[PDB]
């Protein structure tokens, strides 16, 4: 649950992402894959990537980064009223991709890391607080659907 002022911070930060969605999406996935190499094994189309240089050179990884952040941005713009947008993603990630909630924690922290890396000194403590709360809400509502499905 976020206040109006917190949502305003989230959507202000998101403007930074929308200026370069592919570059942000690429770096988020690279941070996930290099920090948590077990996550790469869930992607049949990226498991061939052995080095970060190959990851950086992969145009399909940048494409998928655009898909991921476009979906997340659509959810964030609903300011919590995201049941219709979130349900299909919860279902596909639990039942088809088999993504444990832990990996959603990993990618949430990766987003925070990338924002500081690309905007050092321009991602203030209030903005980090609000973005963190928004990603916690996203993860918590996914977790509720995971529990319904019995997925661990
Ligand atoms: C912010 C969190 C995430 C968002 C918004 C997101 C979004 C998406 C979307 C929109 C798709 C394509 C449609 C679909 O299959 O539902 C997708 C596919 C997929 N996601 Fe995610 N995802 C997220 C996190 C993760 C994480 C953490 C993992 C694994 C560590 C993951 C694994 C996958 C896989 C394996 C696919 C299929 C890729 C393919 O072969 O095309 N997702 N995701």
Swiss-Prot record:
Q: Which residues carry this modification: Phosphoserine?
A: 3
Keyword Iron attributed: yes
Q: Where does nitrite bind?
A: 64
Q: Which SUPFAM superfamilies match?
A: Globin-like
Q: Name one GO biological process term.
A: oxygen transport
**Amino acids binding O2:** 64
Localization per record: Cytoplasm, Sarcoplasm
Which GO terms of the molecular function aspect are on file? heme binding; metal ion binding; nitrite reductase activity; oxygen binding; oxygen carrier activity; peroxidase activity
Catalytic activity reads:
Fe(III)-heme b-[protein] + nitric oxide + H2O = Fe(II)-heme b-[protein] + nitrite + 2 H(+); H2O2 + AH2 = A + 2 H2O
Enzyme Commission code: 1.7.-.-, 1.11.1.-
Q: Name one Pfam family in it.
A: Globin
InterPro entries per the UniProt record, alphabetical: Globin, Globin-like_sf, Myoglobin
Q: Which UniProt keywords apply?
A: Cytoplasm, Heme, Iron, Metal-binding, Muscle protein, Oxidoreductase, Oxygen transport, Phosphoprotein, Transport
**A Gene Ontology CC term for this entry?**
sarcoplasm
Statement: the UniProt record of this protein carries the keyword S-adenosyl-L-methionine: no
Q: Family, per the entry?
A: Belongs to the globin family.
| PANTHER family according to UniProt | MYOGLOBIN
Quote the subunit structure annotation: Monomeric.
Q: What does this protein do?
A: Monomeric heme protein which primary function is to store oxygen and facilitate its diffusion within muscle tissues. Reversibly binds oxygen through a pentacoordinated heme iron and enables its timely and efficient release as needed during periods of heightened demand. Depending on the oxidative conditions of tissues and cells, and in addition to its ability to bind oxygen, it also has a nitrite reductase activity whereby it regulates the production of bioactive nitric oxide.
Question: Per its record, how is this protein called by name?
Answer: Myoglobin
Q: Which organism is it from?
A: Equus caballus
């Amino acid at each position: 649950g976020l206040s109006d002022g917190e949502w305003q911070q989230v959507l202000n930060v998101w403007g930074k992402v929308e200026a370069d969605i592919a570059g942000h999406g690429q770096e988020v996935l690279i941070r996930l894959f290099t920090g948590h190499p077990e996550t790469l094994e869930k992607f049949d189309k990226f498991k061939h990537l052995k080095t970060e240089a190959e990851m950086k050179a992969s145009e399909d990884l940048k494409k998928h980064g655009t898909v991921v952040l476009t979906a997340l941005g659509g959810i964030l713009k609903k300011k919590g009223h995201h049941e219709a947008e979130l349900k299909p993603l919860a279902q596909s990630h639990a039942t088809k991709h088999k993504i444990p909630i832990k990996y959603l924690e990993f990618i949430s922290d990766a987003i925070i890391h990338v924002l500081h890396s690309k905007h050092p000194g321009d991602f203030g403590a209030d903005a980090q607080g609000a973005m963190t709360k928004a990603l916690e809400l996203f993860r918590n509502d996914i977790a509720a659907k995971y529990k319904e499905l019995g997925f661990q």
